Design a protein around this ligand. Structure first.
Ligand SMILES: Nc1ncnc2c1ncn2[C@@H]1O[C@H](COP(=O)(O)OP(=O)(O)O)[C@@H](O)[C@H]1O
Ligand SMILES: Nc1ncnc2c1ncn2[C@@H]1O[C@H](COP(=O)(O)OP(=O)(O)O)[C@@H](O)[C@H]1O
Ligand SMILES: [Mg+2]
Ligand SMILES: [Mg+2]
Lengths: 323, 371, 60, 185, 186
């Protein structure tokens, strides 16, 4: 029978470790070898999170080191912790594998989005059809506000583009933006190539850049602390992990250079819109231009449906007149 | 000129003329679109249905609430609500009558912006005002001091007012009211095997909530009584002739109001919110707030809520203070009553927002004029 | 003197747009968008004022 | 219902098993329903022939993906409710914000109904459209998912701490068949 | 001009004019071919008899139903039915008359496709429409809502219509009707 498993743990933690161990579909010696070799193929964020959440405790390590009987009498959990205690700097190796996989995940997460945000700022500073379209909106608004204090102006802010769909006609179906695009479909079609410049401003950030920047800075700080602990550790851990740490710190330093470039382009976009930089001129401008591009394409689609319905109504009227 | 009072709450709209007691047009604020596609002829079928007409044909209509937790989501649906309550229910022009409007406290300001823009551009008025529902509930209470718990369909808010001076830092808003109680009741009727998954069934479960549900004086004693005996079980006939019978779910539904951990909300009950809003005030005025606890809104129309509220406040407060719950039978209509009281005031006639003020200041004077 | 300010006065009453008026000196800055638009060599798109007077005017 | 468009009538219970075998063999989840419908309308590349046990051969086209599209678009049968990706996103938004990042990267799909060979990329696309671009979206799709509940039961069978959790005959005689409510969740 | 209402039912075809009360030509849809040998020379010996003439001479004719359970099987036979009810029964020009046609629910689509092809190409029309039979039965009832149990000669279907709107998920088709009752009686 042998029920005396001499397990120093309780039931729940040994239960969760027996849940955790059985998904590897192999012996715990292979698990201890993969910890010692630093192999990150089978070790994603969640597995190493569960492994750090099922760490051995101080009295558990003391009872394992005071165990003087036969090691086959132990359970698989206590034998796995003895294999884990056999690895020198095992928690350091687990933290290196977790931080390397998490650093690769956060870098592949943030860096194309940060390149999208930088390309969005570069296309918002330099846009081709945007001054001609803003001059047309300015001339139409100066005709519309003739005789009021808002009229006879030489410009407007970027929040006016959100307010274009607020003004509607007598029918309350064709807006100001819909009428301007119905006129621009006939006269100046190059303004319909406005989203091709705004396609890198399309989809915005969609995120808070301070959240990913604080996560990137905290990950870089954790990588620096980890590289300092590996530099205090043995040379096997150094030859295992120092090149990966150096590549991760170098890529996050390139990410911080990219974030400083986004700050410089944010100040340039604040000076572009003639607004102070103390207000949010970064995420509000991305959300404003994303909503402007979505309303622009929706005005194109609704004017297309309006012209198709008018042509189908003309065809139905001609077919009723012929019959 | 007869002023208008149009309480546009989240679930229902109570509109009518000022200087009146009973609200003239009470109808639910639902917009019914046709769920299934079909053109036919139908002798001029309507493309959308408002309120009682949407309630009548609700089996084949997708029902949309334009207001969620006191905040207007679909503004065109709200414009259709406004067009039906101006032209069909009351049958009055907007440009020949001033119209007082209500608002929950701690509203985001763009709702007030678009409300002012719609009420001056497309449904243009000679004058309008945007007010606070708890102030009108205290006007229907008739006193000047006291704290008001106003619980509509999405918003339950506690507002203390001393001598006509509302304290803005002590206003406490919790987004838990009768729609969330209806959604919790739809969640808990599936224990007995009855399934309600559509929005038309939400009206049936809401009618079950309005008729059969009640506030327990003690939750654990009522739970032990319902577990022991079936004397608290009540039957209800469904519109297809089926009869259901429910036990503890009569009083399990309002206990979300006193214990929001049932639906996983981490906030405390409305009694603790009331006690924290009273204790956020100055220490000199708290005795008037304990004696003038005013309950309004239709969510507080369950026939055990004043006794349970008095029990929980007297458990929370020091015992030397006199605990009094002001619970009128007309607390459902009290916001519209106080709106008629405020619009009937001759001193309030200097406080209206004119069309010329809207033209001069843009859509921005309503933050400076209204509180 | 610029092309965009040369607006013919409407005979009928026109509907009012809402925007916050920029100053003329800020908009005619050399880094600003509108100083190149105030130049006559830029493409001055003339609005069809007859269509806006036909459509967007106030009904009596 | 939709196999009668081409004229293959099925009214009996054995025909339900035959169409169930057809659904298990031929049907698949489309990545984009409108492009697949336009392609099936344009060219007959997706048309596949099935041989019935009597010897007759049928051929179906767009219905290989129109049948699991009811999983994403439940208004096809008139079941007016949200899609299963929308059901998943609303179940995620019912949770706390602290634990949402864990659930975004741990989307396990079980059952044989999820054994269509297009479901993971479409499900990741729909969740990535529904969720914001903050957190990592990862769909867990094991090949042995159809028996996985049984497999998990076998995982729960041999464990050492499960011996106290067994509902005995004596506990059944003591507490009726009602200790399963207070013991199991 | 005057529209034409022609119910091409499974057993019987009922044709007539729009706005009229009783259908003008009610006749069973059968095709009668001679099965024995003809011995008299001349005398207008046709190779196919249609409808009431096929009903009259039915002792020497093999009879074929072109519609089987709401599905047109032989399209040439249905072409002969349509030519007979257009040119012999009603005696109208199809190029100057709109035409309504009736169809069973849950019917295969290519039947409707070939009906559109024959009624636009063979008998070309100014206009045509294809309508569900239960909708027409509720319109003859005059009430806006209800449920129609329509059982012809080939198809028995249950269709509920509420406030003029059809609910397609509850449409229930069963191919058990009076021809199968006739075969069970035989
Ligand atoms: N008899 C009742 N029992 C319980 N709740 C009710 C009852 N009558 C109305 N209500 C609730 O009152 C709310 C309607 O508020 P109402 O008093 O009409 O103000 P408003 O018109 O501003 O919404 C609805 O949410 C409804 O749930
Ligand atoms: N008096 C009657 N009693 C019972 N059944 C009848 C009677 N008269 C006709 N029928 C049945 O109804 C069928 C005719 O239905 P019909 O109106 O032609 O439907 P459809 O137009 O859809 O073919 C015949 O086949 C016959 O079996
Ligand atoms: Mg109201
Ligand atoms: Mg028929």
């Amino acid at each position: 029978k042998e029920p005396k498993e001499i397990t120093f743990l309780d039931a729940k933690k040994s239960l969760n470790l027996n849940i955790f161990l059985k998904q590897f579909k192999c012996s715990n010696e292979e698990v201890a070898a993969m910890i010692r070799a630093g192999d990150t193929t089978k070790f994603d964020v969640e597995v190493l999170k569960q492994l750090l959440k099922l760490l051995p405790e101080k009295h558990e390590i003391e009872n394992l080191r005071a165990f003087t009987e036969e090691r086959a009498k132990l359970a698989s959990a206590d034998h796995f912790y003895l294999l884990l205690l056999a690895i020198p700097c095992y928690q350091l190796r687990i933290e290196c594998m977790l931080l390397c996989e998490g650093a690769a995940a956060v870098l592949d997460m943030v860096r194309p989005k940060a390149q999208l945000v930088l390309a969005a700022c570069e296309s918002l500073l330099t846009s081709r059809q945007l001054p001609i379209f803003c001059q047309l909106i300015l001339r139409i608004g100066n005709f519309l506000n003739y005789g009021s204090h808002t009229g006879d102006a030489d410009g407007f802010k970027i929040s006016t583009l959100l307010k274009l769909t607020e003004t509607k006609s007598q029918q309350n179906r064709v807006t100001l933006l819909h009428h301007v695009l119905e006129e621009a479909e006939k006269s100046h079609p190059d303004l319909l190539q406005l989203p091709r410049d705004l396609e890198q401003p399309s989809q915005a950030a969609g995120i808070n850049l301070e959240i990913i920047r604080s996560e990137a800075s905290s990950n870089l700080k954790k990588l620096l602390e980890t590289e300092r602990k590996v530099s205090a550790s043995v040379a096997e851990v150094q030859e295992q992990y120092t090149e990966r740490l150096q590549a991760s710190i170098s890529a996050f330093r390139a990410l911080d250079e990219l974030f400083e470039a986004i700050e410089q382009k944010q100040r340039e976009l604040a000076d572009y819109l003639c607004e102070d930089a103390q207000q949010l001129s970064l995420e509000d401008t991305f959300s404003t231009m994303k909503a402007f591009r979505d309303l622009f394409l929706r005005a194109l689609k609704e004017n297309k449906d309006r012209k198709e319905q008018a042509a189908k109504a003309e065809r139905r009227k001609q077919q009723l007149a012929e019959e | 000129t007869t002023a208008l009072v149009c309480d546009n709450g989240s679930g229902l709209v109570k509109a009518g003329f000022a200087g009146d007691d009973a609200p003239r047009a009470v109808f639910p604020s639902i917009v019914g679109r046709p769920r299934h596609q079909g053109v036919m002829v139908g002798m001029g079928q309507k493309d959308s249905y408002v309120g009682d007409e949407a309630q009548s044909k609700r089996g084949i209509l997708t029902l949309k609430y334009p207001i969620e937790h006191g905040i207007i989501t679909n503004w065109d649906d709200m414009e259709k609500i406004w067009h039906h309550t101006f032209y069909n229910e009351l049958r009055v022009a907007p440009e020949e009558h001033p119209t007082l409007l209500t608002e929950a406290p701690l509203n985001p300001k763009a709702n007030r912006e678009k409300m002012t823009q719609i009420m001056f551009e497309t449904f243009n008025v000679p004058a309008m005002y945007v007010a606070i529902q708890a102030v009108l509930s205290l006007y229907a209470s008739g006193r000047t001091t006291g704290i008001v718990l106003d619980s509509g369909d999405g918003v339950t808010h506690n507002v203390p007012i001393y001598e006509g001076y509302a304290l803005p830092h002590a206003i406490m808003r919790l987004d838990l009211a009768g729609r969330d109680l209806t959604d919790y009741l739809m969640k808990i009727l599936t224990e007995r095997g009855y399934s309600f998954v559509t929005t038309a069934e939400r009206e049936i479960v809401r009618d079950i909530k309005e008729k059969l549900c009640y506030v327990a004086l003690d939750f654990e004693n009522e739970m032990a009584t319902a577990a022991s005996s079936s004397s608290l079980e009540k039957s209800y006939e469904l519109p297809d002739g089926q009869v259901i019978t429910i036990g503890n779910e009569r009083f399990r539904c309002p206990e979300t109001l006193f214990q929001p951990s049932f639906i996983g909300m981490e906030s405390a009950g409305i009694h603790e919110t009331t006690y924290n809003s009273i204790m956020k005030c100055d220490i000199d005025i708290r005795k008037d707030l304990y004696a003038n606890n005013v309950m309004s809104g239709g969510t507080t129309m369950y026939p055990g809520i004043a006794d349970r509220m008095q029990k929980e406040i007297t458990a929370l407060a020091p015992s030397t203070m006199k605990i009094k719950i002001i619970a009128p039978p007309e607390r459902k209509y009290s916001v519209w009553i106080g709106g008629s009281i405020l619009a009937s005031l001759s001193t309030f006639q200097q406080m209206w927002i004119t069309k010329q003020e809207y033209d001069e200041a843009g859509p921005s004077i309503v933050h400076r004029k209204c509180f | 003197v610029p092309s965009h300010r040369r607006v013919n006065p409407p005979t009928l009453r026109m509907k009012k747009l809402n925007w916050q008026k920029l100053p003329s000196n800020v908009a005619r800055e050399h880094n600003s968008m509108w100083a190149s638009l105030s130049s006559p060599d830029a493409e001055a798109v003339e609005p069809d004022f007859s269509s806006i007077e036909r459509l967007f005017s106030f009904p009596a």
